[PDB]
Scaffold this active site. Sequence first.
Site, PDB file in Angstrom:
ATOM      1  N   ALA A  40      15.423  38.528  79.186  1.00 51.08           N
ATOM      2  CA  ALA A  40      16.431  38.469  80.230  1.00 51.08           C
ATOM      3  C   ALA A  40      17.562  39.495  80.074  1.00 51.08           C
ATOM      4  CB  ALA A  40      16.979  37.058  80.322  1.00 51.08           C
ATOM      5  N   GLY A  70      14.424  44.429  76.522  1.00 42.91           N
ATOM      6  CA  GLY A  70      12.983  44.559  76.369  1.00 42.91           C
ATOM      7  C   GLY A  70      12.550  45.365  75.158  1.00 42.91           C
ATOM      8  N   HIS A 111       4.562  33.749  79.451  1.00 42.30           N
ATOM      9  CA  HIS A 111       5.916  33.237  79.262  1.00 42.30           C
ATOM     10  C   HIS A 111       6.349  33.448  77.812  1.00 42.30           C
ATOM     11  CE1 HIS A 111       8.791  29.505  79.279  1.00 42.30           C
ATOM     12  NE2 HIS A 111       9.444  30.623  79.535  1.00 42.30           N
ATOM     13  N   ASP A 112       7.465  34.143  77.598  1.00 40.19           N
ATOM     14  CA  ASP A 112       7.865  34.568  76.230  1.00 40.19           C
ATOM     15  C   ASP A 112       7.901  33.388  75.236  1.00 40.19           C
ATOM     16  OD1 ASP A 112      10.119  33.539  77.406  1.00 40.19           O
ATOM     17  OD2 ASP A 112      11.376  35.313  77.217  1.00 40.19           O
ATOM     18  N   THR A 129      19.093  32.873  74.030  1.00 38.93           N
ATOM     19  CA  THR A 129      18.214  33.037  75.162  1.00 38.93           C
ATOM     20  C   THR A 129      17.760  31.711  75.803  1.00 38.93           C
ATOM     21  OG1 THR A 129      16.109  32.759  73.971  1.00 38.93           O
ATOM     22  CG2 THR A 129      17.315  34.811  73.535  1.00 38.93           C
ATOM     23  N   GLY A 151      15.580  34.201  69.724  1.00 36.36           N
ATOM     24  CA  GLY A 151      16.862  34.839  69.433  1.00 36.36           C
ATOM     25  C   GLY A 151      17.775  34.020  68.534  1.00 36.36           C
TER      26      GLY A 151
END
Length: 473
Positions: A17, A20, A238-239, A260, A407
């Site tokens: 978000a 990258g 999806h991460d 995140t 994160g």
Amino acid sequence: LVPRGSHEAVLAIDLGATSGRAIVGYLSENKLVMEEINRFSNLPIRVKGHLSWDIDFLLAKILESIRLANTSYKILSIGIDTWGVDFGLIDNEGKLLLQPVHYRDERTKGVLKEISEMTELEKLYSETGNQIMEINTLFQLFKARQESPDSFYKTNKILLMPDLFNYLLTGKFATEKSIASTTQLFDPRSQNWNQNILKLFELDSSLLPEIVSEGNVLGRIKEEYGLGDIPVVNVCSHDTASAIVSVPKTEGSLFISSGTWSLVGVELTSPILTTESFSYGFTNEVGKDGVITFLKNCTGLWIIEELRRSFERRGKAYSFDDIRTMVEKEKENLPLIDTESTEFATESDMHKTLTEYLAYHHETREWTDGQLFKIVYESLAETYRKAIELLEELTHKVYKRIYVIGGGARASYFNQMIADRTGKEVLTGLTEATAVGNIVVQLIAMGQLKGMEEAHHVIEEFLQLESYYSQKN
């Protein structure tokens, strides 16, 4: 005798978000090696009033990463993961209708009041499994259509973010299950689109791409890109789901993020779609091999940051070392705020908002700076501890350990705090989590690894796990 060259590999694209990355990984002496080869910003733009994603910049960085990858490796595949919920609309001639809208766009503020009028929220929950949030794709489509119906008639396809970049590269449409389960359009039991919900919201099923599983070989990168015919693979797109791939598959293990996408959860064999799970704030998303990533969103390490940027504006800027010392030192037991129930607005000053909340709901004092930091840290820790206690009740199980994913290089101390308040071992060393899961999926698909079997033995070799245990004080 004249000497010759290069090494076989897989390209992972991890779009977040805010930033990258492009990561190459390959087998080297039957061990996994991973080199980061490009990293960048993902700065949203305001477009015709809406907060939006700069898609032309993002696609440009994906192509620049592939040319860099081709320069140093033989690339057998590429595989893209992203944040959930957001989508692009494709018109009947295959062009992006407008720039995708950012999940933070104000278009969905107030939207659940209109949804409540058309369906009880628990029913919607029992059909899709997602905790009902304004940002969910369903309500976004509902607002987007409502705001401009005439505009919306031009949509031929709705592409979640990974499917959008996959489409741009290849020309082809597919949505992989892990991203489909963030939409509130997808049934975690049948693991396909929910036609009952589609019927209700009067969205034609044709608008959505076919569901695929992770490892699906979508197509090759278009010939005009000049990159060669590299296969594009549908990964755990999806991460969050890619990160969960790299968590050990042992009975008593939980996972946690505080960045995140802050959450706590566990992989389950089948969903929990009870009033309990609904009323308790839990979500059933889908992950690798169709497992349920059963999880509760929490509010993460961000109120710390905001209270830091609010202490900068008062000319007292602290480092996390300053914050650790400050909090570690303040040894009183301060009020505990129910962080979940806080409503701290967008461009307010966090010092004042927190002072205020405390005064209204607990007590008053000239709260020293270490003390607001302590309260904030202890409150987020307590949110996680309560989340796990509900997780245990709902799952009928008591767990033993918690892997940190996502994160939080900044969160190291918050991790030890998690161990202190939960009584569970907290393990770290998984900051590459997402890229690992992205990469292995592709390695299996191109046949470099046999299956999840080997993949687990390869990830565990790769990870340098560090434990935290509850300390007194």
